[PDB]
Amino acid sequence: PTYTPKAGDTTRSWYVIDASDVVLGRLASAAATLLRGKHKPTFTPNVDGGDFVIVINADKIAVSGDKLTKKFAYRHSGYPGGLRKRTIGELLEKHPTRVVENAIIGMLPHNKLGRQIQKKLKVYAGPDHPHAAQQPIPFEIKQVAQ
Amino acid sequence: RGEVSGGGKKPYRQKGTGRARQGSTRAPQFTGGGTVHGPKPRDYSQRTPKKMIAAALRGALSDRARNDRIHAVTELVEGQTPSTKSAKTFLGTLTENKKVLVVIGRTDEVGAKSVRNLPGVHVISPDQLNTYDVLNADDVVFSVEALNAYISANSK
Amino acid sequence: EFPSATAKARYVRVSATKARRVIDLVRGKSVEEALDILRWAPQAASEPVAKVIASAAANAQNNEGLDPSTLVVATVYADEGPTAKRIRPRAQGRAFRIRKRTSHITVIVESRPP
Amino acid sequence: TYAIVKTGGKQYKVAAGDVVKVEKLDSEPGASVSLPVALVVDGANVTSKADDLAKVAVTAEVLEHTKGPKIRIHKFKNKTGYHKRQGHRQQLTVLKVTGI
Amino acid sequence: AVPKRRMSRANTRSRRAQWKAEAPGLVTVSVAGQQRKVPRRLLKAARLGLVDLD
Amino acid sequence: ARVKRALNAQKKRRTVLKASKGYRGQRSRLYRKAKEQQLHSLTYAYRDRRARKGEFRKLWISRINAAARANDITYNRLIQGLKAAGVEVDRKNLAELAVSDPAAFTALVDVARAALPEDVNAPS
RNA sequence: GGUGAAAAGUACCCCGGGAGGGGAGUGAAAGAGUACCUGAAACCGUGCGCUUACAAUCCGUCAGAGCCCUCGACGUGUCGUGGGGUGAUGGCGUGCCUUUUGAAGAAUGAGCCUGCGAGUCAGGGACAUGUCGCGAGGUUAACCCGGGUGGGGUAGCCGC
RNA sequence: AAGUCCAAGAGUGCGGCAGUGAGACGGCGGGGGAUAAGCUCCGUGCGUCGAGAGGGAAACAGCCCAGAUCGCCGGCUAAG
RNA sequence: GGCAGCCAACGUGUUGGCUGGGUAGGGGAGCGUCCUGCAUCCGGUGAAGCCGCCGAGUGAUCGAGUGGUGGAGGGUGUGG
Ligand SMILES: [Mg+2]
Ligand SMILES: [Mg+2]
Ligand SMILES: [Mg+2]
Ligand SMILES: [Mg+2]
Ligand SMILES: [Mg+2]
Ligand SMILES: [Mg+2]
Ligand SMILES: [Mg+2]
Ligand SMILES: [Mg+2]
Ligand SMILES: [Mg+2]
Ligand SMILES: [Mg+2]
Ligand SMILES: [Mg+2]
Ligand SMILES: [Mg+2]
Ligand SMILES: [Mg+2]
Ligand SMILES: [Mg+2]
Ligand SMILES: [Mg+2]
Ligand SMILES: [Mg+2]
Ligand SMILES: [Mg+2]
Ligand SMILES: [Mg+2]
Ligand SMILES: [Mg+2]
Ligand SMILES: [Mg+2]
Ligand SMILES: [Mg+2]
Ligand SMILES: [Mg+2]
Ligand SMILES: [Mg+2]
Ligand SMILES: [Mg+2]
Ligand SMILES: [Mg+2]
Ligand SMILES: [Mg+2]
Ligand SMILES: [Mg+2]
Ligand SMILES: [Mg+2]
Ligand SMILES: [Mg+2]
Ligand SMILES: [Mg+2]
Ligand SMILES: [Mg+2]
Ligand SMILES: [Mg+2]
Ligand SMILES: [Mg+2]
Ligand SMILES: [Mg+2]
Ligand SMILES: [Mg+2]
Ligand SMILES: [Mg+2]
């Protein structure tokens, strides 16, 4: 029978990704992979064996084109005419982490497990984070050649 | 549904009640209603050709004859007084099988009465001989008069 | 296991759900505490339920020789009895059905160490 | 050490002493059967060339013949009146691996 | 307006569970030397003998 | 010969209701409702026995890919290289190696990479 | 419509205004108590095990963590050619019938269970096709005689 | 003239038993309509649906791929 | 690896080739129920019915396999 994780089997690790000068979409896809646990041979779709991901310098994220002014984050309050929009430029100035957060969350599965996976994402605007006690491993976004 | 008592009137109006439409309280779907395609008295007799009936009887009697199950006797009992005890003993000497067909002429009341009460014994006259009773019996016992009467009416 | 006595009141002219509403106040309590609660409960079905509990306590004393103080109401339930059918005439020839429900009430009391 | 054994169009990782259910083989219980290998792992070293794998065979003993789970099929399509009930139990052979 | 559908066993029970009695809080009173339990609301009446302690 | 139906009729009801144990509400309790669900249940089961083979292969492939990329090779080039080397291990067992014996899997990756063409993106 | 072989139909004691019940008796059995043979299902309770209050569920299916129970070998729990109960979580997934070009359909019918409810029967009827007897012939109708299902009956009929 | 030819389960004739005689969309050739309709009426050894599950097209009878005898925790591909 | 239909090849039933989506509808072969001719068997040392357990067959379904409840009939084979 195919290997299935048991109670004690999942081991977490802590990664830190520097978002400075990284393309938003590229950072988010990489982080979603780590949070989901796709890089582990023990991956199981009904189990969150993902790792913790810390994103630092989330205000230095790079976006190409005119998306800074023309890309709009939309929210609806549920009241008639309750549709509000912000550009990514405005959202980066007021809530720097929200830009990276939304990008990563939208690349996670939209189910109960996905919500549990989101717990393991921590994102910070500045160069620093409070999690030195967890000794995060610097993670660089590489591409395996073929 | 036509023979059941009552049921002549349409129970309620065709439309407006909100109930299924009904034509009679005795319709088949009703409890107490008429039966559909139920039994009716019928005659089951069949017009089997004469030659088939005769050949079947001959076949049955031949099967007994080949297995030596045909016996012949002058009388079941001696005298003019029925006695089941005598007949039972005598039949016991002839056959030990349970079912026995005894073929006796009409006149031999004392023989018929003497065997009548025995459990597996069936009594018949030779003019009434038939496949069912022969095949039901383990052994056929003929009065000599009855056997000759049967042979004569057929082989002549 | 504990020594126990049973009482039943059958064909009590009270709906089983209305009895249950009272019974839920006394399940698991000592017989003394149950009879106090039932004495002051405003519900009508309190009175039939009280009588069954007291009857079971009395059986435990007089038939089984248990002491009354140690008695607790271990198990109690009401089951539905036969329902009588009545008709209430309504407006414009409508005739509606009325159900006169009854219930059976079972109590088991245990002698437990205090 | 362990090997990956081919039998019945399927492959099973087995070591000495392993019990494996495989597709029916024609042998009595107590008979020994010899099976081809797709891979051998002897601790650190991996045998993978077809030439050396042809040299090696796994020996197993037939324990018993058995039946898999009863499968109940009830094909159906709505608004048609089409129903087709069918049952199935696959015949299996149980092997105990003896050596590699 | 009439119910559109029958109500599931679960939904019926969830609502029906809200129909329940609450036990009265009881206090002890000494009357005729014996200690009886009465609602605190009736404490004064019970000492005055205005409550029928059956 | 009037025949009462209960004896024959009840048999199929008991079968269906036994099969529908564990269902919720009317589907566990009423023969007609349980029968309806049984139609779906056995249709689903038949369909999922077929789909199960793809679903497991999907799992194995994902696990092989993670282990391959941890050894600096993509899945597609690993499969190509194993074919070129003539290694006939299927994906069920390749995934079991990736989990239970990373050393053996690493040795297979080396074999596959050696058998790959020098210029994978060259004609032929 | 059915207590039991027999009324032997529950003396007497206990709780209760009664009703009803608990002891004690009768009986082979009260898992037979005049609500009575057997006592299904819907429907309504109580107890125990697992589960469930961040979740969008045609209600199931295939994967499946954790817990509970049980059968083997070994030892203090742990593994197996196991078996049950429950099921976090993941994938897949548009009731049944009728009737329609096409219905998950916001078309029709069904609140639920149990019982009942629809190609049957008559006739030397008609056509075809199996099967059996007899065969250039086959067969009787009415009727007559047998306590029968058997024997007789040539008028007819159908082939030629 | 060959092919297929342990069969297309082919044609033709007779007989027993039918059902059907409301079709839909898509490709190609046309009428009616404004060279409108998810329109309407014909042709097409044209297709699919009807009576067809599976994969693709987000979902999506009629499009693309492919015709489900059952089992497998094997492998290779189609459209994509 | 199991089952089935058609056909072939031989044998005193096995091997092989091909085939096995399906509504209206045609054909074939069966399951379960009751009443009966005949033959057999079980039953107050507990029949039927009902509730379970553990199992069984390609399906309708089965259990002369077994617990519980129950109290008088029932099973099987071959025909009608
Ligand atoms: Mg009259
Ligand atoms: Mg009339
Ligand atoms: Mg009329
Ligand atoms: Mg009648
Ligand atoms: Mg005649
Ligand atoms: Mg009036
Ligand atoms: Mg249709
Ligand atoms: Mg596949
Ligand atoms: Mg009894
Ligand atoms: Mg009653
Ligand atoms: Mg009774
Ligand atoms: Mg929660
Ligand atoms: Mg959603
Ligand atoms: Mg979905
Ligand atoms: Mg229409
Ligand atoms: Mg149609
Ligand atoms: Mg509807
Ligand atoms: Mg609706
Ligand atoms: Mg209409
Ligand atoms: Mg309705
Ligand atoms: Mg017409
Ligand atoms: Mg027409
Ligand atoms: Mg047309
Ligand atoms: Mg049109
Ligand atoms: Mg088609
Ligand atoms: Mg399709
Ligand atoms: Mg491939
Ligand atoms: Mg392609
Ligand atoms: Mg064959
Ligand atoms: Mg078919
Ligand atoms: Mg096919
Ligand atoms: Mg049909
Ligand atoms: Mg039977
Ligand atoms: Mg007895
Ligand atoms: Mg009977
Ligand atoms: Mg028959």
Tab-separated table of N, CA and C in Angstrom, chain A residues 20-119:
chain	number	residue	atom	x	y	z
A	20	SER	N	12.414	41.459	-1.718
A	20	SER	CA	12.992	42.640	-2.347
A	20	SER	C	13.354	42.373	-3.803
A	21	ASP	N	12.840	43.221	-4.696
A	21	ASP	CA	13.061	43.161	-6.139
A	21	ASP	C	12.548	41.878	-6.783
A	22	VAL	N	11.723	41.105	-6.094
A	22	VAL	CA	11.161	39.889	-6.668
A	22	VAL	C	9.809	40.213	-7.286
A	23	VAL	N	9.541	39.624	-8.453
A	23	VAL	CA	8.235	39.774	-9.078
A	23	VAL	C	7.173	39.185	-8.162
A	24	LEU	N	6.086	39.937	-7.963
A	24	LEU	CA	5.003	39.512	-7.081
A	24	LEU	C	4.557	38.085	-7.387
A	25	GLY	N	4.160	37.834	-8.636
A	25	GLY	CA	3.635	36.525	-8.991
A	25	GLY	C	4.634	35.403	-8.780
A	26	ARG	N	5.913	35.668	-9.054
A	26	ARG	CA	6.935	34.643	-8.871
A	26	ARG	C	7.120	34.307	-7.397
A	27	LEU	N	7.240	35.334	-6.553
A	27	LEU	CA	7.296	35.123	-5.110
A	27	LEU	C	6.094	34.331	-4.610
A	28	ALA	N	4.891	34.735	-5.023
A	28	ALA	CA	3.676	34.108	-4.512
A	28	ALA	C	3.585	32.640	-4.910
A	29	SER	N	3.925	32.316	-6.160
A	29	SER	CA	3.886	30.922	-6.592
A	29	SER	C	4.864	30.069	-5.794
A	30	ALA	N	6.079	30.576	-5.574
A	30	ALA	CA	7.068	29.838	-4.795
A	30	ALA	C	6.593	29.621	-3.363
A	31	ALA	N	6.087	30.681	-2.726
A	31	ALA	CA	5.599	30.569	-1.354
A	31	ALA	C	4.436	29.590	-1.257
A	32	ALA	N	3.522	29.628	-2.228
A	32	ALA	CA	2.397	28.699	-2.220
A	32	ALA	C	2.877	27.257	-2.298
A	33	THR	N	3.906	26.999	-3.106
A	33	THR	CA	4.486	25.662	-3.180
A	33	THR	C	4.993	25.204	-1.816
A	34	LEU	N	5.756	26.060	-1.130
A	34	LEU	CA	6.322	25.676	0.161
A	34	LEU	C	5.229	25.472	1.205
A	35	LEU	N	4.241	26.370	1.243
A	35	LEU	CA	3.168	26.259	2.225
A	35	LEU	C	2.363	24.986	2.009
A	36	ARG	N	2.168	24.599	0.750
A	36	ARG	CA	1.389	23.409	0.438
A	36	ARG	C	2.186	22.143	0.722
A	37	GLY	N	3.511	22.231	0.663
A	37	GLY	CA	4.355	21.068	0.848
A	37	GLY	C	4.565	20.260	-0.409
A	38	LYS	N	4.554	20.912	-1.573
A	38	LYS	CA	4.715	20.197	-2.832
A	38	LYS	C	6.143	19.716	-3.040
A	39	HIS	N	7.113	20.338	-2.373
A	39	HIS	CA	8.521	19.980	-2.493
A	39	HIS	C	8.912	18.762	-1.663
A	40	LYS	N	7.991	18.184	-0.901
A	40	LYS	CA	8.351	17.039	-0.071
A	40	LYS	C	7.850	15.747	-0.688
A	41	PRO	N	8.678	14.699	-0.734
A	41	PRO	CA	8.203	13.414	-1.269
A	41	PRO	C	7.075	12.798	-0.460
A	42	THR	N	6.855	13.247	0.772
A	42	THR	CA	5.766	12.752	1.603
A	42	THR	C	4.446	13.473	1.346
A	43	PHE	N	4.398	14.363	0.353
A	43	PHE	CA	3.191	15.130	0.059
A	43	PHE	C	1.967	14.229	-0.062
A	44	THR	N	0.872	14.654	0.569
A	44	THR	CA	-0.417	13.997	0.449
A	44	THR	C	-1.465	15.103	0.360
A	45	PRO	N	-2.381	15.044	-0.612
A	45	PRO	CA	-3.301	16.176	-0.815
A	45	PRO	C	-4.281	16.397	0.326
A	46	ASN	N	-4.595	15.375	1.120
A	46	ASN	CA	-5.490	15.536	2.259
A	46	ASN	C	-4.757	15.882	3.548
A	47	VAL	N	-3.447	16.093	3.485
A	47	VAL	CA	-2.629	16.430	4.641
A	47	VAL	C	-1.907	17.733	4.343
A	48	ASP	N	-1.883	18.639	5.315
A	48	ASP	CA	-0.981	19.786	5.238
A	48	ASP	C	0.330	19.406	5.917
A	49	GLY	N	1.303	18.992	5.107
A	49	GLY	CA	2.676	18.830	5.539
A	49	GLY	C	3.579	19.973	5.125
A	50	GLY	N	2.985	21.099	4.743
A	50	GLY	CA	3.728	22.293	4.390
A	50	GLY	C	4.698	22.814	5.430
A	51	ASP	N	5.575	23.721	5.020
A	51	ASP	CA	6.465	24.419	5.935
A	51	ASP	C	5.964	25.831	6.219
A	52	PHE	N	6.477	26.407	7.303
A	52	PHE	CA	6.224	27.810	7.599
A	52	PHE	C	7.036	28.687	6.656
A	53	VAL	N	6.403	29.735	6.134
A	53	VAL	CA	7.063	30.687	5.249
A	53	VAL	C	6.954	32.077	5.860
A	54	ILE	N	8.095	32.742	6.012
A	54	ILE	CA	8.168	34.148	6.387
A	54	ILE	C	8.603	34.938	5.162
A	55	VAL	N	7.811	35.933	4.784
A	55	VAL	CA	8.181	36.879	3.739
A	55	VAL	C	8.590	38.182	4.409
A	56	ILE	N	9.796	38.652	4.112
A	56	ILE	CA	10.258	39.952	4.575
A	56	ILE	C	10.387	40.898	3.387
A	57	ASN	N	10.459	42.193	3.703
A	57	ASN	CA	10.555	43.263	2.707
A	57	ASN	C	9.398	43.226	1.711
A	58	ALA	N	8.193	42.937	2.206
A	58	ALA	CA	7.039	42.812	1.325
A	58	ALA	C	6.641	44.132	0.678
A	59	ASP	N	7.140	45.262	1.180
A	59	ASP	CA	6.936	46.549	0.527
A	59	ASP	C	7.847	46.764	-0.675
A	60	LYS	N	8.951	46.028	-0.774
A	60	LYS	CA	9.868	46.140	-1.901
A	60	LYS	C	9.516	45.211	-3.057
A	61	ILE	N	8.373	44.522	-2.988
A	61	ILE	CA	7.955	43.655	-4.083
A	61	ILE	C	7.873	44.453	-5.381
A	62	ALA	N	8.221	43.805	-6.490
A	62	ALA	CA	8.193	44.428	-7.806
A	62	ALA	C	6.956	44.002	-8.587
A	63	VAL	N	6.328	44.965	-9.260
A	63	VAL	CA	5.236	44.696	-10.188
A	63	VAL	C	5.558	45.365	-11.519
A	64	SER	N	5.312	44.652	-12.612
A	64	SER	CA	5.652	45.151	-13.934
A	64	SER	C	4.497	45.944	-14.540
A	65	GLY	N	4.793	46.610	-15.656
A	65	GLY	CA	3.786	47.308	-16.429
A	65	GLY	C	3.172	48.488	-15.696
A	66	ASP	N	1.925	48.780	-16.053
A	66	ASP	CA	1.118	49.793	-15.392
A	66	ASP	C	0.245	49.218	-14.284
A	67	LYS	N	0.468	47.955	-13.903
A	67	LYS	CA	-0.357	47.312	-12.883
A	67	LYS	C	-0.381	48.104	-11.583
A	68	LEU	N	0.687	48.847	-11.293
A	68	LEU	CA	0.732	49.650	-10.077
A	68	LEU	C	-0.420	50.648	-10.009
A	69	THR	N	-0.838	51.193	-11.151
A	69	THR	CA	-1.962	52.120	-11.200
A	69	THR	C	-3.251	51.516	-11.747
A	70	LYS	N	-3.176	50.511	-12.622
A	70	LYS	CA	-4.368	50.010	-13.297
A	70	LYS	C	-4.906	48.692	-12.752
A	71	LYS	N	-4.109	47.919	-12.023
A	71	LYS	CA	-4.621	46.747	-11.322
A	71	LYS	C	-5.383	47.157	-10.063
A	72	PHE	N	-6.615	46.664	-9.924
A	72	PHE	CA	-7.500	47.037	-8.826
A	72	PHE	C	-7.846	45.809	-7.995
A	73	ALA	N	-7.627	45.906	-6.685
A	73	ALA	CA	-8.191	44.966	-5.723
A	73	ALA	C	-9.624	45.375	-5.394
A	74	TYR	N	-10.572	44.471	-5.622
A	74	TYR	CA	-11.987	44.750	-5.420
A	74	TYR	C	-12.497	44.080	-4.150
A	75	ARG	N	-13.372	44.784	-3.437
A	75	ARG	CA	-14.034	44.262	-2.250
A	75	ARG	C	-15.497	44.680	-2.303
A	76	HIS	N	-16.396	43.789	-1.888
A	76	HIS	CA	-17.816	44.104	-1.799
A	76	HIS	C	-18.307	43.878	-0.375
A	77	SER	N	-18.929	44.906	0.205
A	77	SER	CA	-19.388	44.851	1.588
A	77	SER	C	-20.678	44.061	1.765
A	78	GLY	N	-21.382	43.738	0.684
A	78	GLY	CA	-22.682	43.113	0.769
A	78	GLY	C	-23.853	44.069	0.829
A	79	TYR	N	-23.607	45.359	0.954
A	79	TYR	CA	-24.642	46.370	0.815
A	79	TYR	C	-24.738	46.838	-0.635
A	80	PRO	N	-25.941	47.227	-1.117
A	80	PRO	CA	-26.118	47.732	-2.517
A	80	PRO	C	-25.128	48.856	-2.792
A	81	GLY	N	-24.436	48.803	-3.933
A	81	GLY	CA	-23.400	49.806	-4.239
A	81	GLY	C	-22.260	49.727	-3.242
A	82	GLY	N	-22.021	48.546	-2.667
A	82	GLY	CA	-20.966	48.393	-1.647
A	82	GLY	C	-19.688	47.855	-2.259
A	83	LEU	N	-19.454	48.140	-3.542
A	83	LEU	CA	-18.208	47.689	-4.217
A	83	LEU	C	-17.127	48.773	-4.093
A	84	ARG	N	-16.036	48.472	-3.394
A	84	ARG	CA	-14.921	49.444	-3.257
A	84	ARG	C	-13.676	48.886	-3.959
A	85	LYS	N	-12.844	49.770	-4.507
A	85	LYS	CA	-11.644	49.316	-5.187
A	85	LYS	C	-10.444	50.151	-4.762
A	86	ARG	N	-9.289	49.496	-4.689
A	86	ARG	CA	-8.010	50.155	-4.475
A	86	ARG	C	-7.024	49.679	-5.529
A	87	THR	N	-6.169	50.582	-5.998
A	87	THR	CA	-5.072	50.147	-6.846
A	87	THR	C	-4.007	49.450	-6.003
A	88	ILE	N	-3.178	48.646	-6.672
A	88	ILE	CA	-2.056	48.011	-5.985
A	88	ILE	C	-1.082	49.053	-5.458
A	89	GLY	N	-0.921	50.166	-6.175
A	89	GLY	CA	-0.125	51.263	-5.646
A	89	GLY	C	-0.639	51.768	-4.311
A	90	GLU	N	-1.933	52.092	-4.246
A	90	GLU	CA	-2.506	52.595	-3.001
A	90	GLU	C	-2.462	51.538	-1.906
A	91	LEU	N	-2.731	50.279	-2.262
A	91	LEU	CA	-2.712	49.203	-1.277
A	91	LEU	C	-1.309	48.937	-0.748
A	92	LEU	N	-0.285	49.080	-1.591
A	92	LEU	CA	1.090	48.922	-1.127
A	92	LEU	C	1.492	50.003	-0.133
A	93	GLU	N	0.990	51.227	-0.308
A	93	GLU	CA	1.319	52.305	0.620
A	93	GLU	C	0.605	52.148	1.960
A	94	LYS	N	-0.668	51.750	1.948
A	94	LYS	CA	-1.411	51.651	3.199
A	94	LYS	C	-1.227	50.309	3.901
A	95	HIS	N	-1.295	49.205	3.162
A	95	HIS	CA	-1.208	47.861	3.732
A	95	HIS	C	-0.212	47.035	2.929
A	96	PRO	N	1.089	47.288	3.106
A	96	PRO	CA	2.094	46.627	2.252
A	96	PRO	C	1.956	45.115	2.211
A	97	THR	N	1.684	44.490	3.359
A	97	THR	CA	1.637	43.034	3.428
A	97	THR	C	0.438	42.471	2.675
A	98	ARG	N	-0.659	43.232	2.596
A	98	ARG	CA	-1.884	42.731	1.978
A	98	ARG	C	-1.656	42.316	0.528
A	99	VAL	N	-0.805	43.047	-0.197
A	99	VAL	CA	-0.552	42.726	-1.601
A	99	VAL	C	0.008	41.315	-1.725
A	100	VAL	N	1.079	41.027	-0.984
A	100	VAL	CA	1.698	39.707	-1.034
A	100	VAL	C	0.744	38.655	-0.478
A	101	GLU	N	0.094	38.960	0.648
A	101	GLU	CA	-0.877	38.048	1.249
A	101	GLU	C	-1.945	37.609	0.255
A	102	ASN	N	-2.611	38.573	-0.384
A	102	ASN	CA	-3.675	38.243	-1.327
A	102	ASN	C	-3.160	37.378	-2.468
A	103	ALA	N	-1.992	37.721	-3.013
A	103	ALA	CA	-1.416	36.936	-4.100
A	103	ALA	C	-1.212	35.479	-3.694
A	104	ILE	N	-0.647	35.244	-2.507
A	104	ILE	CA	-0.371	33.873	-2.088
A	104	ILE	C	-1.663	33.126	-1.778
A	105	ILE	N	-2.594	33.773	-1.070
A	105	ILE	CA	-3.841	33.114	-0.688
A	105	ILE	C	-4.624	32.684	-1.923
A	106	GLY	N	-4.615	33.507	-2.971
A	106	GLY	CA	-5.304	33.158	-4.200
A	106	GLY	C	-4.692	31.999	-4.958
A	107	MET	N	-3.479	31.590	-4.599
A	107	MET	CA	-2.822	30.435	-5.192
A	107	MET	C	-2.903	29.192	-4.316
A	108	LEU	N	-3.484	29.297	-3.142
A	108	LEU	CA	-3.767	28.134	-2.319
A	108	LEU	C	-5.141	27.560	-2.655
A	109	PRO	N	-5.346	26.262	-2.427
A	109	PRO	CA	-6.692	25.691	-2.578
A	109	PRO	C	-7.722	26.402	-1.710
A	110	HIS	N	-8.895	26.638	-2.295
A	110	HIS	CA	-9.995	27.323	-1.615
A	110	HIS	C	-10.886	26.297	-0.913
A	111	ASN	N	-10.342	25.719	0.154
A	111	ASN	CA	-11.069	24.740	0.946
A	111	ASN	C	-10.610	24.843	2.396
A	112	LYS	N	-11.154	23.963	3.240
A	112	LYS	CA	-10.807	23.970	4.658
A	112	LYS	C	-9.307	23.801	4.863
A	113	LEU	N	-8.701	22.838	4.165
A	113	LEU	CA	-7.260	22.628	4.287
A	113	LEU	C	-6.491	23.889	3.916
A	114	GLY	N	-6.913	24.564	2.843
A	114	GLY	CA	-6.257	25.798	2.438
A	114	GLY	C	-6.222	26.835	3.543
A	115	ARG	N	-7.324	26.965	4.283
A	115	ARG	CA	-7.380	27.908	5.396
A	115	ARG	C	-6.400	27.517	6.496
A	116	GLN	N	-6.275	26.219	6.775
A	116	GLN	CA	-5.290	25.756	7.747
A	116	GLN	C	-3.870	26.008	7.250
A	117	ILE	N	-3.643	25.866	5.943
A	117	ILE	CA	-2.323	26.132	5.373
A	117	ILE	C	-1.957	27.604	5.535
A	118	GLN	N	-2.933	28.501	5.361
A	118	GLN	CA	-2.669	29.936	5.465
A	118	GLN	C	-2.097	30.319	6.826
A	119	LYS	N	-2.407	29.546	7.874
A	119	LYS	CA	-1.852	29.806	9.202
A	119	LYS	C	-0.334	29.920	9.179
